[PDB]
Paper text:
A well-studied carbonic anhydrase II was selected for rational design as it has efficient CO2 hydration activity and could be heterologously expressed in Escherichia coli. Thus, to better understand the key factors controlling halophilicity in enzymes and to develop a halotolerant biocatalyst for hypersaline conditions, we undertook rational enzyme design by selecting just one of several mechanisms present in halophilic enzymes: increasing the incidence of acidic residues on the enzyme surface. Herein, we describe for the first time the successful redesign of a mesohalophile enzyme to an extremely halotolerant orthologue, that is, one that is active at 3 M NaCl and above, by altering 18 surface residues. In contrast to suggestions that large differences in accessible solvent area, non-polar surface area or absence of large hydrophobic amino acids are the important features that allow halophilic enzymes to function optimally in high-salt environments, we have found that increasing the number and distribution of surface acidic groups alone is sufficient to impart this characteristic.
The conversion from mesohalophile to extreme halotolerant enzyme is conducted in stages to assess the effects of substitutions on overall protein stability and degree of halotolerance. Crystal structures of WT and engineered enzymes were obtained to confirm the presence of changed residues, that active site residue positioning was unaffected and also to compare the overall structural similarity of the designed proteins with that of WT. The structures of the four engineered enzymes superposed almost perfectly with the WT enzyme (maximum root mean square deviation (RMSD)=0.42 Å for M4) with no significant differences apparent in their secondary structures. Some of the orientations of other surface residues of M1–M4 were also altered compared with the WT, although none, with the exception of N62D, were in the vicinity of the active site. Up to 18 amino acid substitutions were made to the enzyme surface of bCAII, but this did not significantly alter the secondary structure, catalytic activity or stability of the designed enzymes, compared with WT, in the presence of added salts.
Numbering used by the authors: 4 to 260
The structure:
């Protein structure tokens, strides 16, 4: 088992998951001075118009909104990518107070939470196959910046009472993941990993420059979830972010700049 406390948190994961100290781990700090433009980069092409949400699940480390990835209803193309990537799920990371919780940082600045929209490359057939390949996954990272209430986010938060403990799920149809995107789609990109065990090095990271908003009040609702299953002792889901990992050999690129 793994988690986010002093003893089982990120600093210890390397013992059970050696790849934690590897060459393309995420998240990273994005130093905007070192960011470079690249004329090969394209605008991000998100097509979430037919996206079909199925359910919401507490997986014991976070909560996921699952999408129907059996066809091309919710696809991600272009940006830094070649091919088509299907949306399989999104989930969030957040911290114990509003001044922390994002996984990526910008010139060391942290936000209150971060949304990850996970996509797999269709040339690999399924998520499991895709997850093992360097070009297999694409994750769009969206910062949640504390400020005004976010009404799109509120629909997600209203279901959280129904999935308090590990393993619970609730049906969650009709949620549009495009409603949790900012209006401008400028992004930073770098080759990285999943930010949770097994920490697979299979992700092209697409971190959006513009955050979406969230209220302090709304942030308290994230923190009502439990890491523990029902019947075990309570362990509140107050914080589930991995800190910045060393950039090592990698280049962060920016679009449009
Ligand atoms: Zn994540």
């Amino acid at each position: 088992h793994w988690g986010y406390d002093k003893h089982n948190g990120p600093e210890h994961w390397h013992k059970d998951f050696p790849i934690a100290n590897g060459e393309r781990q995420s998240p990273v700090d994005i130093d905007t001075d070192a960011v470079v433009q690249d004329p090969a980069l394209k605008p991000l092409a998100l097509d979430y118009g037919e996206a079909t949400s199925r359910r919401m699940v507490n997986d014991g480390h976070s909560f996921n909104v699952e999408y129907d990835d059996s066809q091309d209803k919710a696809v991600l193309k272009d940006g830094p990518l070649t091919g088509t990537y299907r949306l399989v799920q999104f989930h969030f990371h957040w911290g114990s107070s509003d001044d922390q919780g994002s996984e990526h940082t910008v010139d060391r600045k942290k936000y209150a939470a971060e949304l990850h929209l996970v996509h797999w490359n269709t040339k690999y057939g399924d998520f499991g196959t895709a997850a093992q390949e360097p070009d297999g996954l694409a994750v769009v990272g969206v910062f949640l910046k504390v400020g005004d209430a976010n009404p799109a986010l509120q629909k997600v938060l209203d279901a959280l009472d129904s999935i308090k403990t590990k393993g619970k799920s609730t049906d969650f149809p009709n949620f549009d993941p495009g409603s949790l995107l900012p209006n401008v789609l400028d992004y930073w990109t770098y080759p990285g990993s999943l930010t949770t065990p097994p920490l697979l090095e299979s992700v092209t990271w697409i971190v959006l420059k513009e955050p979406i908003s969230v209220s302090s009040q709304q942030m308290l609702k994230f923190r009502t979830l439990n890491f523990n299953a029902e019947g075990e002792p309570e362990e509140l889901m107050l914080a589930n972010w991995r800190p910045a990992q060393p950039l090592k050999n990698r280049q962060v690129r920016g679009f449009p700049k």
